[PDB]
Amino acid sequence: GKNVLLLGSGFVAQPVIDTLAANDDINVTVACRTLANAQALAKPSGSKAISLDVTDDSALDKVLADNDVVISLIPYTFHPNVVKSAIRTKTDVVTSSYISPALRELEPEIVKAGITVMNEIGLDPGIDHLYAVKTIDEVHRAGGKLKSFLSYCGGLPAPEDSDNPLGYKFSWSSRGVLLALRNSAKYWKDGKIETVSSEDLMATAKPYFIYPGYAFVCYPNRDSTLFKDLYHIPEAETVIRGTLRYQGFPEFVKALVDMGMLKDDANEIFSKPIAWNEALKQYLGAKSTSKEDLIASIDSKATWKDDEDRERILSGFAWLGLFSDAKITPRGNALDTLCARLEELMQYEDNERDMVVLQHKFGIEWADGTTETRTSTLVDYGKVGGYSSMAATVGYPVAIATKFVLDGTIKGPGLLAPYSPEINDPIMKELKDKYGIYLKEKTVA
Amino acid sequence: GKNVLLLGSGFVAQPVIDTLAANDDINVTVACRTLANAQALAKPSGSKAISLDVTDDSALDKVLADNDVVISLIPYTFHPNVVKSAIRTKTDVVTSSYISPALRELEPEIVKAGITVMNEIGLDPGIDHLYAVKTIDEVHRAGGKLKSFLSYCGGLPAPEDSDNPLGYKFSWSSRGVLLALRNSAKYWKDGKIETVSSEDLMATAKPYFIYPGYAFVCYPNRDSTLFKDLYHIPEAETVIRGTLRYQGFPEFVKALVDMGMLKDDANEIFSKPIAWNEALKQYLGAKSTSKEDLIASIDSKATWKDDEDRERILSGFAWLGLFSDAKITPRGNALDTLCARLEELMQYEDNERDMVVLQHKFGIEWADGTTETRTSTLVDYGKVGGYSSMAATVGYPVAIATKFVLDGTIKGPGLLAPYSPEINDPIMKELKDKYGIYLKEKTVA
């Protein structure tokens, strides 16, 4: 049959290996730095397993040449190494990553080599593009105008598993999640560009209604303007892509900001494993380590929405052990010390489920001047003793695309991405049919 | 072994029959009006099945006498018939219902007869009492004062299945759900009684935070004052029991109220199967049946929270087909005609899940004057191709109590209810151990 090489040892690797190895005519080889990882990832399906250093050009060529396609699920800074090897060996490539400037530089050689490098085909990017392109194509074909494109996505605990101060669980690092509300954002609104500064992003966070059961808030991503050219919606007045969190998340982060706790400046208060209450005493200039004095210094620095929120946030600080004798992870700055504690206390437990939510909302003006709003909505949950939704919604599109590269449903050569119905339709159909994963499409009544 | 009679043909009956019949030493007989129902309810477990008219004293005695205990899962107005028969036959009884004045009248004969009639042991009442008594008993035993008791419960769609205008699904009638926001309410707050009139209940509805993931609102039930004597918390300043719904539910109902749609007065506009848009035209005095004119008459009658809510509610009316040519169920009044449409459009589908949420929150003042807040929280979901949470959370406590009546863990005789640790502890322990059902107990940090 066909020989598939998978590079990676993330949780995303497991469903890809498992769904592909289940096919009798596909032989999977798992490659990680350490043979044991790969043997472990490969063990459930009895796949071949090897060790591999991707920076070793010769080692990398040897194994790519033994295969028909390589799935690169390693950090995106390594894709160029993989692709350089694929050019040399004439091997096809599949990634879930945004096309990088390094890959664009290789693009003429990819074409000359006659290989297919399929990109941007997990969840985000991937599934989002499939369904955005689908509707916009339908709207344009019917002579319609896409006046508004809104798109919001989050990976969150299932609501029943959300009871922590952020309504958020880490797998595994928290630094990016935390700093996200201190980024700038640029998007289209009502026929003009709006930009929000780092300082001002926090205040933009607002409830975002999807279904009655959920309490989502949203904030815009760094740059939504790229989707105008990407989806060819020059006529759109409003184009905003953002992130979903649960209620309370921005207010919690804001309080931490006001306390200086997202500052990454080297600061000796965080140099050594002292008690959290002593660290905060020194950092906030509190009278003492007593909960009462710590709260006084927080109160003097924080702007609270109301007493209920103040009570909630301070209780969350208490839950985190910030007012306690628990010893800090000595990371040498406020931010990383905070992140270490968040990470330690807010991981998934074995009977807990994650969730992916993604909704596109389209405001359409038809030729006759009539307007309508459509939604395309995905809610997906992890399976206890199975795969997380975060793993499955990346891994399954990747597996489907790999099979389509192998059998020529996805026709190259070239540096391809899910930007047209011709590539997109077969993937959407197979994703729904095989895995039950699809976006519910509704017109707002 | 032991012989158990089950009266009932509700969805609650299935898990009770099934969990009890799985026991080798329990022989279940299912009794409904029609042999086929009972044979169907009994079929999965191969239980005995009979037909039975509960108003026929002789038929009822015959079968009770053949059994060691009867589980009465039929309407509460029939329990007296069952209990009169149990007195005659000396058979024990288990119900999930609040003790009625009719049962209290029989109480001295129950005692003289030497039978045990166990009551109020499903979810609400049942599980709620187990855990409320538990904490209050713990607080009192440690010399503490229960200053505040808050308790909120709802049966709702899982959030992923909540996408309808009410965030609510019917199984099967909607009339009570709808009129609930037009009831009065009486409770304790800050050391005084507060009462809310029928008209004013709507305005009391407010967000109620349990976990970040969920968007709950709550309103108080008809009478919370009874829990002071029931749980013996004379020292409580605040005692409020209420119902949980999802965000948007009260505002939707309020709009319908403003339109006169919850009026049950005989009204010929609803006498015959005309189109919804024609019915509303006549009822609202709209210019025409056009969506535009219907909305105009709604706008002229309704107070909207904001444009987003107005848009949401009107869209929901559209979804319901109220602006459409769909023919009304001719119920002869506005309310029942509305309820028929709600019921028709908002039932569970086969791959959908329900949810039960119940939280007690206790504000405690300890002897030393220190205060703390505790929560006890249950979130439980239905199983696709299995039992709903609404069925399981009533049926399992009933099954456990029945086994305890049979084996004398619950010691009678008498008209008993789950009001003390002696009765309550064994049930809570078995509910957790056998079914994984328990309330998570936390101190607010």
UniProtKB/Swiss-Prot annotation, chains A, B:
Coiled-coil residue windows: none
Signal peptide per UniProt: none
Protein name per UniProt: Saccharopine dehydrogenase [NADP(+), L-glutamate-forming]
Quaternary structure and partners: Interacts with TRM112.
Residues noted as binding L-saccharopine in the record, renumbered to the chain: S97, Y98, D124, R222, T243, L244, R245
Organism, as annotated: Saccharomyces cerevisiae (strain ATCC 204508 / S288c) (Baker's yeast)
One Gene Ontology term from the biological process aspect of the record: lysine biosynthetic process via aminoadipic acid
A GO MF label: saccharopine dehydrogenase (NADP+, L-glutamate-forming) activity
The encoding gene: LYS9
Reactions accelerated catalytically: L-saccharopine + NADP(+) + H2O = (S)-2-amino-6-oxohexanoate + L-glutamate + NADPH + H(+)
Positions annotated to bind NADP(+): 9-12, 32-34, 53-54, 74, 96-97, 123-125, 173
Pathway assignment: Amino-acid biosynthesis; L-lysine biosynthesis via AAA pathway; L-lysine from L-alpha-aminoadipate (fungal route): step 2/3
Family: Belongs to the saccharopine dehydrogenase family.
PANTHER family cross-referenced by the UniProt entry: ALPHA-AMINOADIPIC SEMIALDEHYDE SYNTHASE, MITOCHONDRIAL, SACCHAROPINE DEHYDROGENASE
A GO cellular-component term linked to this record: cytoplasm
Record key words, sorted: Amino-acid biosynthesis, Lysine biosynthesis, NADP, Oxidoreductase
Enzyme class: oxidoreductase
Protein EC: 1.5.1.10
Misc: Present with 57500 molecules/cell in log phase SD medium.
